[PDB]
């Protein structure tokens, strides 16, 4: 599971998830999995999609993860009242906004990349589409 090696603070405010994404372009690889929807993706989901792509496409090829969790989400224990401090951290989530490219891939044919990204998207909570580089 992806997670920051070190973090300045253990806990983080919930915050909102407004706006569109800044990683809108296919930068590293040739193909990419853009986000059409909005939401959170935990490290478990990101890693599950990574298993999916890596096993679907051949071992050959290069895969980039454009998204990192870097957000500590907390849960209160079960059967516990409200208050008495903030809940302890349980998992890490990458906030996604429409247009964020999540993964990129290179060294692969068009159709095989499409199949791998379809299998990956089957593992993710948000709507995702398939994109390719463009000149400039």
């Amino acid at each position: 599971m992806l997670q920051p090696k070190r973090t300045k603070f253990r806990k983080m405010h919930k915050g909102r998830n407004r706006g569109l994404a800044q990683g809108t372009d296919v930068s590293f690889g040739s193909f990419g999995l853009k986000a059409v929807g909005r939401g959170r993706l935990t490290a478990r989901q990101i890693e599950a999609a990574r298993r999916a792509m890596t096993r679907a496409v051949k071992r050959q090829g290069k895969i980039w993860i454009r998204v990192f969790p870097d957000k500590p989400i907390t849960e209160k224990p079960l059967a516990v009242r409200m208050g008495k401090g903030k809940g302890n951290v349980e998992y890490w989530v990458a906030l996604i906004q429409p247009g964020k490219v999540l993964y990129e891939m290179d060294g692969v044919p068009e159709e095989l990349a499409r199949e791998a990204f379809k299998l990956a998207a089957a593992k993710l909570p948000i709507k995702t589409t398939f994109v390719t580089k463009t000149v400039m």
Binding site: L20, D25, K34, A35, P98, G99, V135, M136
Partner: protein, 94 residues
């Protein structure tokens, strides 16, 4: 040698640009050269079917606006975040 048809915009702003993009046109600009910038509106579907080609971005384009052609080249393009739609195209003259 790609040729595009453009009309000079009347109103400029957030609302006007949104109205254009709802009306299937979209804003664009031609700056550079020895004269002032020109804000135009472009037919979105034609521009997409034309710019799908990679040569649209290295070839010299001719934008016919109010009867006169301008020889220009696409500098930058604002793409919609999660849809195949262009939001704005910059053209440097020549």
């Amino acid at each position: 040698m790609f040729t595009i048809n453009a009309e000079v915009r009347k109103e400029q702003g957030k609302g006007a640009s949104r109205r254009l993009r709802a009306a299937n046109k979209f804003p664009a600009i031609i700056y550079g050269g020895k004269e002032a910038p020109l804000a135009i509106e472009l037919d979105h579907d034609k521009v997409m079917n034309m710019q799908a080609k990679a040569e649209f971005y290295s070839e010299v384009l001719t934008i016919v606006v109010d009867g006169k052609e301008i020889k220009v080249k696409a500098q930058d393009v604002q793409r919609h975040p999660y849809k195949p739609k262009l939001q704005h195209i910059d053209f440097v003259r020549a």
